[PDB]
Chain A
Amino acid sequence: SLVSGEKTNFNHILRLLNTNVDGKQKVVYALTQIKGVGRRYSNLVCKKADVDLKKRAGELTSEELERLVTIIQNPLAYKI
């Protein structure tokens, strides 16, 4: 009568750099919602940060969320 619901609160709106609305869609379809970010650009961001395309937005830990917000500031520091 006690099973951990530590993951079951995921379908809520996440906040990010510019957009205050970013819900669960996927990991690469959630990156398109930020303005200036493209559909071919969003796949390059995910292959560097060792995040899987299978996961959603909201299935990421408080460490793994911010790793995509540093690398969206400087695309030159991580090679491109």
Chain B
Amino acid sequence: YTLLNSDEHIGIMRKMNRDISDARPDITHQCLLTLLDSPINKAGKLQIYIQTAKGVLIEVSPTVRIPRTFKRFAGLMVQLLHRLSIKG
């Protein structure tokens, strides 16, 4: 159970011939890192939602500090997508 990225699933998506560039959670990770480190989040005037391609809409609290590394982020995102919540 791991997010579908271009790290290790490059062979699977290149074999099944469907848009190897689309399955990139790293864009979401680096952009969410940017927004959580930005001072408009630290001041408290930022509210952030994510929409995935499955129709999943995730509110991200401003009071969270995300894992900075993609492996822990992928495990956290899998647990979020399956348990519908992450408690502190």
Touch between A and B in complex, CB under 8 Å?
A: no
Chain A positions within 8 Å of B, measured between CB atoms, are none
Chain B positions within 8 Å of A, measured between CB atoms, are none
